[PDB]
Amino acid sequence: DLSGLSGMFGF
Amino acid sequence: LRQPIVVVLGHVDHGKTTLLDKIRRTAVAAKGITQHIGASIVPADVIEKIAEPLKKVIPVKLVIPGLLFIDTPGHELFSNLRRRGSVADFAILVVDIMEGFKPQTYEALELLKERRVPFLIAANKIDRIPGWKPNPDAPFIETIRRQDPKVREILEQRVYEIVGKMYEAGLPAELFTRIKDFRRKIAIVPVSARTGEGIPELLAVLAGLTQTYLKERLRYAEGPAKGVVLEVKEMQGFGTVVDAVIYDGVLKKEDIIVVGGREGPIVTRVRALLMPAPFVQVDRVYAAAGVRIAAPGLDDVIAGSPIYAAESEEEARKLMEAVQREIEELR
Ligand SMILES: Nc1nc2c(ncn2[C@@H]2O[C@H](COP(=O)(O)OP(=O)(O)O)[C@@H](O)[C@H]2O)c(=O)[nH]1
């Protein structure tokens, strides 16, 4: 994931 | 890079107008917007401010300069952004979470598919879920943690219904907090255009996705302007003017332009460029902008027409065949 938005994954 | 150009689609009464107005209000409060004709710009600084509560969970650093939101939503405007794909770089598909997909939701899907415009879904009116207790302006991931568990359970049932429709349509989608690869699944972002809840994720996803994956389209090239006409109207003291979106280059006062009209290609010259007063005249506009263009001979311009600036009369003449060919593919 180059966007880094999968930092939200699990919320 | 220049600003991504963002269009808002979805069924009547699902909250398009409301959402665009909440975004603008949120941006005006952060600092706030830039005033363009038919469009509003949220600057990168403002997006970074609005996304501040997410800074520890996601990287919030922007290399785009901002996002340009087209202020008129829906399908007729989207049709007026088509070009030999679209001028739109990204779309928000608004779905009222209580109602689900309606007929204009599926029309918007077809248009998006045909023009290959990337998008996300804003699952709006989450404030209307029975039991919702608002935390205004908060990120979705913060406010949902404060709702009753039955509220999360209803929300997930409605999201699952959306995910089902989307899969049926050939398009994998998921709640944005259940995606690992944002190139492969369309993000569903729950929001409330009334309370502002979810607007921070909304803006962070748009900014994240556009700046990550669209850098080739968003490259600014210094050159004569390229644009599209969005509206044609009469303006007192200027005659027929056009409201346009400039997506590459620079448009200047006294530039020659070529535009499509009903009796063939129009070759004219910019007499004034108008922007909202903080109308005022400006000497030039750079991509991406919404601008109002006063020039002679625009009475018969076709909405949706390309507009191409030209350095000389001879390069203008050479553009007239392309413009007519474009206009034909758009009928
Ligand atoms: N409770 C609530 N009402 C909303 C929300 N967004 C839109 N509305 C209301 O729903 C109606 C339709 O919204 P509008 O923005 O006009 O819909 P559009 O036709 O898609 O542009 C109006 O009464 C809005 O006030 C929302 O998030 N929450």
Tab-separated table of C-alpha atoms and ligand atoms in Angstrom:
chain	number	residue	atom	x	y	z
A	1	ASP	CA	0.000	0.000	0.000
A	2	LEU	CA	1.818	3.038	-1.228
A	3	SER	CA	-0.875	5.489	-0.067
A	4	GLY	CA	-0.365	4.573	3.538
A	5	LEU	CA	-4.199	4.675	4.089
A	6	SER	CA	-4.194	1.008	5.156
A	7	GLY	CA	-2.921	2.433	8.409
A	8	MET	CA	-6.751	2.561	9.062
A	9	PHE	CA	-7.217	-1.077	8.646
A	10	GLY	CA	-9.088	-2.607	11.696
A	11	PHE	CA	-10.965	0.499	12.869
B	1	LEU	CA	1.492	18.829	-9.598
B	2	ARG	CA	-1.694	20.666	-9.925
B	3	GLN	CA	-5.002	20.143	-7.885
B	4	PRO	CA	-7.085	17.061	-8.584
B	5	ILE	CA	-10.450	17.947	-9.989
B	6	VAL	CA	-13.228	16.239	-8.008
B	7	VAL	CA	-16.856	15.656	-9.071
B	8	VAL	CA	-19.744	14.559	-6.841
B	9	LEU	CA	-22.309	12.103	-8.116
B	10	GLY	CA	-25.262	10.173	-6.682
B	11	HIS	CA	-29.087	9.975	-6.398
B	12	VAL	CA	-31.298	12.828	-5.763
B	13	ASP	CA	-31.705	13.717	-2.110
B	14	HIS	CA	-28.736	11.510	-1.030
B	15	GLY	CA	-26.817	14.597	0.105
B	16	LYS	CA	-24.581	15.786	-2.708
B	17	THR	CA	-25.194	19.500	-2.277
B	18	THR	CA	-24.995	19.178	1.467
B	19	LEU	CA	-21.745	17.315	1.422
B	20	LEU	CA	-20.076	19.823	-0.858
B	21	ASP	CA	-21.307	22.690	1.343
B	22	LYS	CA	-20.012	20.873	4.560
B	23	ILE	CA	-16.632	20.424	3.010
B	24	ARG	CA	-16.401	24.106	2.016
B	25	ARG	CA	-17.620	25.186	5.557
B	26	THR	CA	-15.077	22.921	7.210
B	27	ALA	CA	-12.277	24.350	5.045
B	28	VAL	CA	-13.483	28.027	5.699
B	29	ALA	CA	-13.385	27.264	9.451
B	30	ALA	CA	-9.894	25.665	9.414
B	31	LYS	CA	-8.058	28.954	8.650
B	32	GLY	CA	-9.881	28.630	4.179
B	33	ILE	CA	-11.196	27.923	0.614
B	34	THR	CA	-10.162	29.622	-2.655
B	35	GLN	CA	-12.889	31.184	-4.540
B	36	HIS	CA	-13.166	30.014	-8.189
B	37	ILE	CA	-16.064	30.227	-10.600
B	38	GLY	CA	-18.181	27.073	-10.196
B	39	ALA	CA	-15.643	25.385	-7.961
B	40	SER	CA	-13.923	25.682	-4.638
B	41	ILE	CA	-10.353	24.842	-3.785
B	42	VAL	CA	-9.349	23.294	-0.497
B	43	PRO	CA	-5.646	24.097	-0.110
B	44	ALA	CA	-3.180	21.349	0.942
B	45	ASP	CA	-2.477	23.218	4.202
B	46	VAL	CA	-6.146	23.153	5.054
B	47	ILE	CA	-6.517	19.500	4.156
B	48	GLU	CA	-3.491	18.815	6.472
B	49	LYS	CA	-5.215	20.758	9.225
B	50	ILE	CA	-8.515	18.945	8.858
B	51	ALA	CA	-6.679	15.537	8.744
B	52	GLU	CA	-4.577	16.386	11.919
B	53	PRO	CA	-6.411	13.899	14.151
B	54	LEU	CA	-5.394	11.120	11.821
B	55	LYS	CA	-1.649	12.005	11.817
B	56	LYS	CA	-0.584	9.030	13.928
B	57	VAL	CA	-2.536	6.449	12.094
B	58	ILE	CA	-1.902	7.499	8.538
B	59	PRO	CA	0.706	9.700	6.856
B	60	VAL	CA	-1.032	12.981	6.146
B	61	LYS	CA	1.681	14.749	4.175
B	62	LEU	CA	0.473	16.288	0.867
B	63	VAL	CA	2.452	16.786	-2.349
B	64	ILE	CA	-0.671	18.023	-4.171
B	65	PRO	CA	-1.309	21.605	-3.790
B	66	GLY	CA	-4.945	21.234	-2.967
B	67	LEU	CA	-8.228	19.679	-4.192
B	68	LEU	CA	-10.606	21.494	-6.567
B	69	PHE	CA	-14.272	20.526	-5.923
B	70	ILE	CA	-16.725	21.203	-8.678
B	71	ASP	CA	-19.518	22.898	-7.006
B	72	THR	CA	-22.368	21.563	-9.225
B	73	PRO	CA	-23.015	17.876	-8.583
B	74	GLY	CA	-24.624	15.217	-10.625
B	75	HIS	CA	-24.948	13.715	-14.003
B	76	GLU	CA	-25.439	16.640	-16.411
B	77	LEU	CA	-22.281	18.296	-15.043
B	78	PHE	CA	-20.433	15.079	-15.251
B	79	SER	CA	-21.440	14.724	-18.900
B	80	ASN	CA	-19.980	18.253	-19.427
B	81	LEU	CA	-16.578	17.067	-18.106
B	82	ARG	CA	-16.143	14.399	-20.711
B	83	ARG	CA	-13.189	14.828	-23.007
B	84	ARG	CA	-11.513	12.664	-25.646
B	85	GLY	CA	-12.047	10.024	-20.495
B	86	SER	CA	-12.970	13.039	-18.328
B	87	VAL	CA	-11.521	16.239	-17.017
B	88	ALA	CA	-12.551	14.973	-13.559
B	89	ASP	CA	-9.678	13.204	-11.859
B	90	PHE	CA	-11.728	11.571	-9.096
B	91	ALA	CA	-15.329	11.274	-8.077
B	92	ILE	CA	-17.243	11.028	-4.816
B	93	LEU	CA	-20.292	8.735	-5.231
B	94	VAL	CA	-22.713	9.788	-2.514
B	95	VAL	CA	-25.080	7.075	-1.263
B	96	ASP	CA	-27.615	7.716	1.523
B	97	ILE	CA	-26.720	4.867	3.892
B	98	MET	CA	-30.377	4.369	5.033
B	99	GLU	CA	-31.714	4.171	1.508
B	100	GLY	CA	-29.004	2.387	-0.412
B	101	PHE	CA	-28.380	2.357	-4.153
B	102	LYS	CA	-31.218	4.059	-6.172
B	103	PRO	CA	-31.581	4.416	-9.992
B	104	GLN	CA	-29.299	7.486	-10.315
B	105	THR	CA	-26.647	5.619	-8.260
B	106	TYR	CA	-26.489	3.025	-11.014
B	107	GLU	CA	-26.480	5.602	-13.724
B	108	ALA	CA	-23.477	7.283	-12.048
B	109	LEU	CA	-21.734	3.865	-11.932
B	110	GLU	CA	-22.127	3.371	-15.677
B	111	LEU	CA	-20.814	6.873	-16.411
B	112	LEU	CA	-17.868	6.326	-14.099
B	113	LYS	CA	-17.038	3.007	-15.735
B	114	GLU	CA	-17.338	4.324	-19.258
B	115	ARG	CA	-15.093	7.288	-18.577
B	116	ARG	CA	-12.679	5.354	-16.260
B	117	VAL	CA	-12.923	7.891	-13.548
B	118	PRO	CA	-11.615	6.488	-10.213
B	119	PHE	CA	-13.852	7.043	-7.249
B	120	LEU	CA	-14.858	6.355	-3.675
B	121	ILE	CA	-18.286	6.026	-2.011
B	122	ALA	CA	-19.431	8.465	0.658
B	123	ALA	CA	-22.029	6.592	2.657
B	124	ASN	CA	-23.825	9.674	3.874
B	125	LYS	CA	-26.501	10.410	6.583
B	126	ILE	CA	-24.875	8.074	9.147
B	127	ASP	CA	-26.450	10.565	11.733
B	128	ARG	CA	-29.852	9.085	10.769
B	129	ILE	CA	-28.887	5.533	12.013
B	130	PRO	CA	-31.242	4.860	14.990
B	131	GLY	CA	-29.289	5.636	18.138
B	132	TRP	CA	-26.591	7.827	16.630
B	133	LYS	CA	-25.234	10.372	18.977
B	134	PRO	CA	-23.163	12.945	17.185
B	135	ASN	CA	-19.661	14.085	17.762
B	136	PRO	CA	-19.496	17.011	15.377
B	137	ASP	CA	-16.776	17.203	12.889
B	138	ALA	CA	-15.016	14.167	14.327
B	139	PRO	CA	-13.210	11.475	12.222
B	140	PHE	CA	-15.294	8.547	11.497
B	141	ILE	CA	-12.918	6.168	13.331
B	142	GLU	CA	-13.275	8.350	16.546
B	143	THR	CA	-17.012	8.796	16.512
B	144	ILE	CA	-18.003	5.240	15.666
B	145	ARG	CA	-16.027	4.080	18.820
B	146	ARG	CA	-18.517	6.222	20.763
B	147	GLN	CA	-21.696	4.902	19.345
B	148	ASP	CA	-23.860	2.057	20.844
B	149	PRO	CA	-22.907	-1.353	19.580
B	150	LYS	CA	-26.214	-1.807	17.908
B	151	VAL	CA	-25.330	1.396	15.933
B	152	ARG	CA	-22.141	-0.181	14.556
B	153	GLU	CA	-24.104	-3.341	13.772
B	154	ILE	CA	-26.741	-1.437	11.718
B	155	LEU	CA	-24.014	0.583	9.919
B	156	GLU	CA	-22.149	-2.655	8.968
B	157	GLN	CA	-25.430	-4.219	7.667
B	158	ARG	CA	-25.971	-1.125	5.390
B	159	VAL	CA	-22.376	-1.100	4.294
B	160	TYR	CA	-22.623	-4.870	3.516
B	161	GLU	CA	-25.646	-4.127	1.295
B	162	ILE	CA	-23.575	-1.555	-0.565
B	163	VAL	CA	-20.709	-3.949	-0.898
B	164	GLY	CA	-23.219	-6.535	-2.357
B	165	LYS	CA	-24.517	-4.103	-5.009
B	166	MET	CA	-21.072	-3.077	-5.975
B	167	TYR	CA	-19.814	-6.702	-6.390
B	168	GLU	CA	-22.944	-7.372	-8.529
B	169	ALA	CA	-21.828	-4.499	-10.634
B	170	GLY	CA	-18.336	-5.765	-11.209
B	171	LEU	CA	-16.672	-3.444	-8.749
B	172	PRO	CA	-15.125	-4.699	-5.544
B	173	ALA	CA	-15.705	-2.284	-2.661
B	174	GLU	CA	-15.300	-2.355	1.143
B	175	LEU	CA	-15.467	-0.221	4.260
B	176	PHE	CA	-12.406	1.886	4.152
B	177	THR	CA	-11.076	0.413	7.420
B	178	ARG	CA	-11.105	-3.125	5.837
B	179	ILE	CA	-8.913	-2.478	2.824
B	180	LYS	CA	-5.277	-3.376	2.433
B	181	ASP	CA	-4.807	-2.387	-1.180
B	182	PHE	CA	-6.595	0.856	-2.146
B	183	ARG	CA	-5.802	0.152	-5.814
B	184	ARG	CA	-7.952	-2.919	-5.756
B	185	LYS	CA	-11.070	-2.077	-3.795
B	186	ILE	CA	-13.320	1.006	-3.892
B	187	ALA	CA	-13.329	2.649	-0.455
B	188	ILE	CA	-16.712	3.164	1.319
B	189	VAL	CA	-16.316	6.084	3.741
B	190	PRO	CA	-19.217	6.714	6.094
B	191	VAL	CA	-19.949	10.380	6.658
B	192	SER	CA	-22.583	12.864	7.793
B	193	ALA	CA	-22.895	15.918	5.599
B	194	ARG	CA	-25.068	17.389	8.499
B	195	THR	CA	-22.585	16.911	11.375
B	196	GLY	CA	-19.305	16.655	9.640
B	197	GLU	CA	-18.474	13.216	11.120
B	198	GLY	CA	-16.219	11.341	8.678
B	199	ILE	CA	-15.218	14.441	6.738
B	200	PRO	CA	-11.635	14.033	7.925
B	201	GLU	CA	-11.252	10.491	6.533
B	202	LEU	CA	-13.154	11.590	3.432
B	203	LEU	CA	-10.531	14.293	2.735
B	204	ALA	CA	-7.583	12.144	3.721
B	205	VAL	CA	-8.663	9.311	1.413
B	206	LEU	CA	-9.257	11.637	-1.533
B	207	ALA	CA	-5.951	13.346	-1.047
B	208	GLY	CA	-4.148	10.020	-0.452
B	209	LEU	CA	-5.463	8.310	-3.418
B	210	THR	CA	-5.103	11.124	-5.917
B	211	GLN	CA	-1.620	12.138	-4.973
B	212	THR	CA	-0.441	8.516	-4.771
B	213	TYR	CA	-1.871	7.006	-7.978
B	214	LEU	CA	-2.584	9.968	-10.407
B	215	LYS	CA	0.690	11.870	-10.414
B	216	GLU	CA	0.996	11.437	-14.301
B	217	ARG	CA	-2.322	13.215	-14.871
B	218	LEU	CA	-1.734	15.829	-12.272
B	219	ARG	CA	1.590	17.051	-13.712
B	220	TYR	CA	1.391	20.762	-14.449
B	221	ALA	CA	2.907	21.532	-18.028
B	222	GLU	CA	3.546	25.213	-18.735
B	223	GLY	CA	1.801	25.847	-22.067
B	224	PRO	CA	-1.353	27.340	-23.542
B	225	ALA	CA	-4.433	26.399	-21.450
B	226	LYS	CA	-6.587	23.396	-22.031
B	227	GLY	CA	-10.123	23.400	-20.503
B	228	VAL	CA	-13.750	22.529	-20.785
B	229	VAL	CA	-16.865	24.710	-20.880
B	230	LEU	CA	-19.313	24.045	-18.089
B	231	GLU	CA	-21.894	26.688	-18.626
B	232	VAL	CA	-22.882	29.322	-21.179
B	233	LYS	CA	-24.702	32.367	-19.921
B	234	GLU	CA	-25.438	35.989	-20.430
B	235	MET	CA	-23.651	38.385	-18.198
B	236	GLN	CA	-24.583	42.052	-18.028
B	237	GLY	CA	-21.733	44.159	-19.293
B	238	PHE	CA	-19.897	41.233	-21.052
B	239	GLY	CA	-22.518	39.465	-23.218
B	240	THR	CA	-22.380	35.714	-23.443
B	241	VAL	CA	-19.651	34.405	-21.177
B	242	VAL	CA	-18.566	30.840	-20.461
B	243	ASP	CA	-17.718	29.227	-17.099
B	244	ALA	CA	-14.921	26.844	-17.629
B	245	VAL	CA	-12.474	24.529	-15.893
B	246	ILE	CA	-8.867	24.879	-16.893
B	247	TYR	CA	-7.074	21.502	-16.360
B	248	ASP	CA	-3.659	22.254	-17.962
B	249	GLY	CA	-1.505	25.249	-18.670
B	250	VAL	CA	-2.246	28.893	-18.240
B	251	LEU	CA	-5.027	31.088	-19.580
B	252	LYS	CA	-4.331	34.697	-20.036
B	253	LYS	CA	-6.156	37.866	-20.772
B	254	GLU	CA	-5.794	38.475	-24.607
B	255	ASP	CA	-5.092	34.894	-25.419
B	256	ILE	CA	-6.592	33.513	-28.589
B	257	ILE	CA	-8.961	30.587	-27.919
B	258	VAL	CA	-10.724	27.925	-29.907
B	259	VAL	CA	-14.017	26.539	-28.680
B	260	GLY	CA	-16.833	24.479	-30.100
B	261	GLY	CA	-20.054	25.958	-31.165
B	262	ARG	CA	-23.354	24.886	-32.822
B	263	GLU	CA	-22.384	26.351	-36.239
B	264	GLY	CA	-18.777	25.111	-36.052
B	265	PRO	CA	-15.514	25.999	-34.230
B	266	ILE	CA	-15.289	29.474	-32.712
B	267	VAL	CA	-11.960	31.382	-32.781
B	268	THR	CA	-11.891	34.294	-30.569
B	269	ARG	CA	-9.820	36.172	-28.068
B	270	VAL	CA	-10.115	36.529	-24.257
B	271	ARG	CA	-11.316	39.953	-23.320
B	272	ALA	CA	-11.630	39.443	-19.538
B	273	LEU	CA	-11.058	36.624	-17.053
B	274	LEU	CA	-13.446	36.931	-14.060
B	275	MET	CA	-13.171	35.349	-10.564
B	276	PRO	CA	-15.223	35.864	-7.425
B	277	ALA	CA	-14.427	39.050	-5.419
B	278	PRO	CA	-12.859	38.157	-2.010
B	279	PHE	CA	-16.530	39.566	-9.526
B	280	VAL	CA	-12.933	40.803	-10.086
B	281	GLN	CA	-10.734	40.682	-13.242
B	282	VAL	CA	-7.540	38.717	-13.141
B	283	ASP	CA	-4.745	38.714	-15.701
B	284	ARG	CA	-4.354	34.939	-15.794
B	285	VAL	CA	-5.349	31.628	-14.240
B	286	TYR	CA	-3.318	28.481	-13.886
B	287	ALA	CA	-4.582	24.930	-13.920
B	288	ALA	CA	-6.612	23.749	-12.035
B	289	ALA	CA	-9.086	26.625	-12.016
B	290	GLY	CA	-12.736	27.524	-12.463
B	291	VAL	CA	-12.903	30.783	-14.336
B	292	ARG	CA	-15.400	32.854	-16.200
B	293	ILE	CA	-14.207	33.850	-19.706
B	294	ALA	CA	-15.597	36.961	-21.536
B	295	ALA	CA	-14.734	36.892	-25.238
B	296	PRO	CA	-16.647	37.914	-28.337
B	297	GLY	CA	-18.625	35.395	-30.297
B	298	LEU	CA	-19.435	32.837	-27.661
B	299	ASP	CA	-23.311	32.947	-28.166
B	300	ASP	CA	-23.412	29.542	-29.837
B	301	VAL	CA	-20.812	27.653	-27.665
B	302	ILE	CA	-21.798	24.135	-26.737
B	303	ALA	CA	-21.548	23.234	-22.991
B	304	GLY	CA	-19.065	20.453	-22.640
B	305	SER	CA	-16.932	21.847	-25.405
B	306	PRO	CA	-13.206	21.759	-25.138
B	307	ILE	CA	-11.415	25.052	-24.941
B	308	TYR	CA	-7.850	25.436	-26.212
B	309	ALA	CA	-5.717	28.477	-26.009
B	310	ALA	CA	-3.371	29.194	-28.964
B	311	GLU	CA	-0.111	31.219	-29.227
B	312	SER	CA	-1.009	32.444	-32.779
B	313	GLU	CA	-3.773	32.725	-35.336
B	314	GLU	CA	-2.111	30.019	-37.350
B	315	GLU	CA	-1.972	27.497	-34.467
B	316	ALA	CA	-5.674	28.398	-33.787
B	317	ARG	CA	-6.611	27.444	-37.237
B	318	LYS	CA	-4.913	24.146	-36.892
B	319	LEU	CA	-6.985	23.484	-33.679
B	320	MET	CA	-10.332	24.053	-35.269
B	321	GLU	CA	-10.502	20.565	-36.868
B	322	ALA	CA	-9.689	18.843	-33.474
B	323	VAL	CA	-12.325	20.819	-31.747
B	324	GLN	CA	-14.950	19.913	-34.261
B	325	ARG	CA	-13.941	16.194	-34.104
B	326	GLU	CA	-14.322	16.412	-30.234
B	327	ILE	CA	-17.616	18.032	-30.396
B	328	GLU	CA	-18.840	15.260	-32.734
B	329	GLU	CA	-17.735	12.454	-30.380
B	330	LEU	CA	-19.636	14.245	-27.581
B	331	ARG	CA	-23.049	14.403	-29.451
C	1	LIG	N1	-29.690	14.183	8.701
C	1	LIG	C1	-29.038	14.442	7.558
C	1	LIG	N2	-29.672	15.093	6.553
C	1	LIG	C2	-28.904	15.347	5.437
C	1	LIG	C3	-27.487	14.909	5.266
C	1	LIG	N3	-27.031	15.302	4.019
C	1	LIG	C4	-28.103	15.830	3.396
C	1	LIG	N4	-29.206	15.957	4.317
C	1	LIG	C5	-30.571	16.506	4.013
C	1	LIG	O1	-31.064	15.633	3.034
C	1	LIG	C6	-31.755	16.450	2.026
C	1	LIG	C7	-31.167	16.342	0.637
C	1	LIG	O2	-29.812	16.847	0.613
C	1	LIG	P1	-29.152	17.465	-0.710
C	1	LIG	O3	-27.812	17.876	-0.321
C	1	LIG	O4	-30.050	18.468	-1.181
C	1	LIG	O5	-29.295	16.268	-1.680
C	1	LIG	P2	-28.761	16.190	-3.266
C	1	LIG	O6	-30.015	16.182	-4.076
C	1	LIG	O7	-28.046	14.834	-3.351
C	1	LIG	O8	-27.917	17.379	-3.607
C	1	LIG	C8	-31.800	17.857	2.534
C	1	LIG	O9	-32.874	18.035	3.384
C	1	LIG	C9	-30.572	17.873	3.421
C	1	LIG	O10	-30.647	18.712	4.550
C	1	LIG	C10	-26.984	14.132	6.337
C	1	LIG	O11	-25.805	13.719	6.303
C	1	LIG	N5	-27.755	14.022	7.464
